[PDB]
């Protein structure tokens, strides 16, 4: 609240300093921000505690940055950490005390939890509460009465209005409890699903699962883990532990196929007990319990087949022990979020690898599913070797003079097709691909503009893939990329980042970018995180290049796009010039070639 | 360096400066490798010796050391060819110099220099001294232009500010001496005191200025005896740099926070720590003020926390490269005053004018293909006179 002569807020008169400050490695700002030391001997203990009570926002190598909020404190109380159980240790760890504001915030957040519990039974959602005064003073607003369908006091609530009531309670200071007591539940018989000994659970996976299962009752929340880290394995383990009917929701056909494959590989459950509620292929969804479908499958708003109506009505009628939702970052979308209310589930676990978006709808996920349970430390995984180390880089390509002339001259938005296609970046990517090709490194080129992708691919006579590409040709190209030594590069369009199971690649070049999309950046980066059989963290075998054009809007998009990665800790090194480019022969070495490309770009319209 | 300072002097001032007490010893210590030995050798000789002996008294290997030492001491005029006997005055004084004839102080020096830097920056609370203010103003690192309003800080001021304490103080004293001659204070008398430290009206005023700078402290109500501080004769880092342009500095003295705020955006200030961000706005602000990326990198490196000393390089490459690129972008467009030529009837005349401009140094850039060139306004008069002369 107090501002120094500079931008920073002043806290000299706010909180004191502990005498044994050097012993205490923890800081506590009044706003809730906490700065932990990664060099302290008790760093691991501090990390566990701060991860339990707070969500990371920046975890560089030296000083980690956490911030706590109501949802994080609720998650701590869910794993059973009382207000004293957290605040006492926070004061002990803190080297400068705990401001009264944070003290009262912690007390209020912890006490305002568990008073209101939401439990669904016999397809009816009852708002139970041991304390009656909470309901007595909670029925002030008319929205509660109109929402409601027309000790331990409970009342049934309308299915459709659950989301609205949930978001209302969040700001009403009475969060709802979505814990599932699968251990004590006889209404829905347990499913015959077991985890085979073959599956191996990594320490971070076990920690995330423990945080989800803080007690005997499973907690509904979001666990953010890298795509290469085995989030599919974690989800399968969660379903197996729940031992009740599970409905996994993908985002595309490849996602549903991979989820079925993961279920069979890691769970002893029989093949016949798994169904694919997909229009292209139906495996008798009503016959068995464990189901895999997608958000468009359930939330579809327009006409439905008669068979799909029967399946949908069966799904609505039945109650699900677990509702796994992969790629939760798309949930707050209108149609996708309608699925949450369409289907009934005790705990709706959420898995993803890039929980970031521009529109401030990510906060809605906290109430749509639950608080962010776990968020794996990418740097720690890199050190442990679970994830391949990446030498993140941004190759700056100077724009050609004529291209810049038209780019600046026109105030329209042909620049997206212009600066994405310039001779300098073309030569840069050509040289980079040549260097890695002679180095036997697998290349996965990326480009949002299909026009630029096709032009680059034809000029380099490479197998470019994109949306309307036939499925058979897609599979043939991927198989050749994985097996044929003669080919070691594939030029994938935006479809690549959506969802796929692609072979591990040693480099990932990105000539163009869709825009300032942290989601797309992280999604594409996750491709090369696939750990090799015997690599090492320090070898930096994996590389990521995000080619950008200097003095262009692409620079703004790149800088705005690398925020999530730098927050994780990756250091994007800038490369002004590439050694050996002048000696190596490359296309567009003469003005005429650039002129023809420019004429084609102008004629693109 | 002190070698530069003494090299830039006349023989008449040199021999006088070679005072009996200390100068002959302080200038001796300056002698890097071999001149010391040669001085001791020809310290007891009253007969000059041929130059060939000195030339051949160093083996073929490492002869460049012999040449450089001889040139340096020829500049100092310690001897004369006399045809290489040393100066008789220096010989006698050196023979007289060779068998012939605190914890609170360092803190005081630190505090006094810190308050001086606080005044140097726009600190509302600082020590007031009109003589110190005017001295810094005429030192070339500050300009007021309005006695009523407090003086501001010039471009050179920021560069001086970001320098390390040793170099900062040494340059400050160099400017002190140069301005001492301008104000009329005898240079030799004040200079000899500095040498005597490492072992009149002008002396009292000079000692007052030194005590103001914090190098000395009488401690006895300005008595004749003085106890020089450590800085008179001539530490761990605290900043931690992340990979996301974030600085966590364990600073309690406001001076360090101000120095960091000169090129970073401050976010939080804890009792024993402060958080700042190195953004384009702050870095380009400093570069516009006059700083260059080298000073910022050096400052962050020297004030480097021990935690990041283990990693090599100490400063992350991304941070260093980003700072350098940010400074470069500012001077992408290089401005240079000049005068253009047009309508060259013949290339022979243009080439002759180009040769003349090259000889005089007037030319700044030339274009043979377009038959044109650019000349600075200073050389515009010269080239115009040449054209008039035809």
């Amino acid at each position: 609240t107090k501002v120094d002569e500079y931008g920073a807020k002043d806290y000299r008169l706010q909180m004191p300093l502990k005498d044994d400050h050097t012993s205490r490695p923890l800081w506590v700002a009044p706003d809730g921000h906490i700065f932990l030391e990664a060099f302290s001997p008790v760093y691991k203990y501090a990390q566990d505690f701060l991860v339990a009570i707070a969500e990371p926002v920046c975890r560089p190598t030296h000083v980690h940055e956490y911030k706590l909020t109501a949802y994080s404190l609720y998650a701590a109380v869910s794993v059973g950490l009382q207000t004293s159980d957290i605040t006492e240790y926070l004061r002990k760890l803190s080297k400068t005390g705990v401001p009264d504001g944070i003290m009262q915030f912690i007390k209020l957040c912890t006490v305002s939890y568990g008073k209101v519990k939401l439990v669904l039974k016999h397809n009816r959602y009852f708002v139970e509460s041991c304390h009656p005064d909470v309901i007595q003073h909670l029925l002030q607003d008319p929205v509660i009465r109109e929402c409601r369908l027309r000790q331990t006091v409970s009342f049934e609530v309308k299915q459709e209005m659950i989301e609205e009531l949930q978001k209302r309670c969040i700001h009403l200071e009475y969060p709802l409890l979505a814990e599932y007591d699968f251990r004590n539940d006889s209404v829905n018989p347990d499913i015959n699903i077991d985890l085979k000994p073959t599956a191996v659970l990594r320490p971070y996976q076990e920690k995330s699962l423990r945080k989800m299962f803080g007690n005997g009752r499973a907690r509904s929340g979001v666990i953010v883990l890298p795509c290469g880290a085995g989030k599919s394995l974690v989800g399968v383990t969660a379903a197996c532990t729940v031992r009740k009917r599970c409905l996994v929701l993908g985002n595309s056909a490849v996602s549903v196929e991979q989820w079925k494959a993961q279920f069979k590989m890691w769970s002893t459950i029989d093949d016949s007990q798994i169904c694919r509620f997909t229009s292209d292929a139906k495996d008798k969804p009503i016959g068995c319990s464990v189901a895999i479908s997608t958000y468009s499958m359930l939330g579809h708003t327009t006409k439905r087949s008669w068979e799909a109506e029967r399946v949908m009505e069966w799904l609505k009628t039945q109650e699900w022990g677990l509702m796994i939702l992969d790629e939760v970052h798309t949930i707050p979308a209108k149609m996708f979020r309608r699925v949450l209310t369409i289907v009934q589930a005790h705990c709706k676990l959420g898995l993803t690898a890039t929980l970031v978006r521009e529109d401030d709808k990510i906060v809605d996920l906290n109430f749509l599913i639950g608080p962010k349970l776990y968020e794996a430390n990418w740097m720690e995984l890199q050190n442990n070797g679970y994830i391949a180390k990446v030498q993140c880089a941004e190759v700056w390509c100077p724009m050609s003079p004529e291209f810049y002339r038209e780019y600046v001259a026109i105030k329209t938005k042909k620049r997206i097709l212009l600066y994405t296609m310039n001779p300098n970046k073309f030569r840069a990517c050509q040289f980079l691909i040549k260097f890695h090709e002679r180095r036997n490194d697998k290349i996965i080129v990326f480009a949002d503009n299909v026009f630029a992708l096709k032009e680059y691919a034809i000029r380099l006579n490479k197998p470019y893939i994109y949306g309307p590409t036939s499925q058979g040709e897609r599979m043939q190209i991927l198989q050749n990329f994985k097996h044929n030594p003669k080919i070691n590069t594939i030029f994938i369009s935006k479809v690549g980042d959506t969802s796929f199971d692609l072979p591990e690649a040693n480099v990932l070049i990105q000539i163009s970018s869709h825009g300032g999309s942290r989601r797309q950046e992280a999604q594409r980066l996750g491709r090369v995180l696939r750990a090799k059989k015997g690599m090492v963290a320090e070898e930096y075998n994996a590389f990521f290049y995000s080619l950008v054009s200097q003095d262009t809007q692409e620079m703004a998009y790149s800088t705005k796009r690398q925020r999530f990665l730098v927050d994780q800790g990756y250091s994007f090194k800038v490369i002004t010039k590439l050694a050996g480019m002048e000696e190596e022969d490359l296309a567009f070495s003469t003005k005429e070639e650039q002129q023809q490309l420019l004429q084609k770009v102008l004629a693109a319209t | 360096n002190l070698q530069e300072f003494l090299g830039g002097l006349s023989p008449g001032v040199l021999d006088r400066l070679y005072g009996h007490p200390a100068t002959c010893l302080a200038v001796f210590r300056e002698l890097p490798s071999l001149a010391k030995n040669w001085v001791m050798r020809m310290l007891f000789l009253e007969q000059p010796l041929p130059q060939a002996a000195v030339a051949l008294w160093v083996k073929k290997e490492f002869s460049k050391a012999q040449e450089e030492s001889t040139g340096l001491l020829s500049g100092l005029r310690i001897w004369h060819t006399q045809l290489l006997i040393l100066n008789p005055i220096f010989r006698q004084n050196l023979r007289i110099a060779l068998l012939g004839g605190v914890p609170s102080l360092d803190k005081y020096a630190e505090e006094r220099w810190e308050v001086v830097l606080h005044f140097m920056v726009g600190s509302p609370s600082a020590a007031v001294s009109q003589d110190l203010a005017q001295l810094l103003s005429q030192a070339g690192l500050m300009k007021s232009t309005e006695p009523g309003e407090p003086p501001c800080i010039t471009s050179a001021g920021f560069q001086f500010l970001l320098l390390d304490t040793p170099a900062q103080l040494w340059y400050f004293m160099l400017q002190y001496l140069q301005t001492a001659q301008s104000r009329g204070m005898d240079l030799v008398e004040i200079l000899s005191f500095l040498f005597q430290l490492s072992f009149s009206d002008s002396l009292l005023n000079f000692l007052q200025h030194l005590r103001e700078f914090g190098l000395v402290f009488q401690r006895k109500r300005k008595s004749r005896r003085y106890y020089p501080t450590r800085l008179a004769i001539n530490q761990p880092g605290f900043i931690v740099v992340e990979t996301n342009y974030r600085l966590y500095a364990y600073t309690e003295s406001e001076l360090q926070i101000a120095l960091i705020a000169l090129f970073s955006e401050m976010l939080y200030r804890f009792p024993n720590m402060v958080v700042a961000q190195v953004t384009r706005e702050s870095v380009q602000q400093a570069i516009a003020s006059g700083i260059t990326a080298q000073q910022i990198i050096h400052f962050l490196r020297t004030r480097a926390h021990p935690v990041m000393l283990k990693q090599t390089p100490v400063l992350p490459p991304t941070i260093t490269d980003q700072i350098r690129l940010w400074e470069l972008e500012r001077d992408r467009l290089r401005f240079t005053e000049g005068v253009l030529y047009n309508q060259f009837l013949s290339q022979v005349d243009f080439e002759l004018l180009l040769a003349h401009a090259r000889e005089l140094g007037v030319l700044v850039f030339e274009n043979s293909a377009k038959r044109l060139m650019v000349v600075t306004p200073a050389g515009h008069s010269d080239v115009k006179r040449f054209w008039k002369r035809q």
Partner: peptide
């Protein structure tokens, strides 16, 4: 063998 490229090993900025 399998050594990192020059432009990633060391800063390519002119400084």
């Amino acid at each position: 063998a399998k050594e990192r490229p020059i432009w990633l090993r060391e800063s390519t900025v002119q400084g």
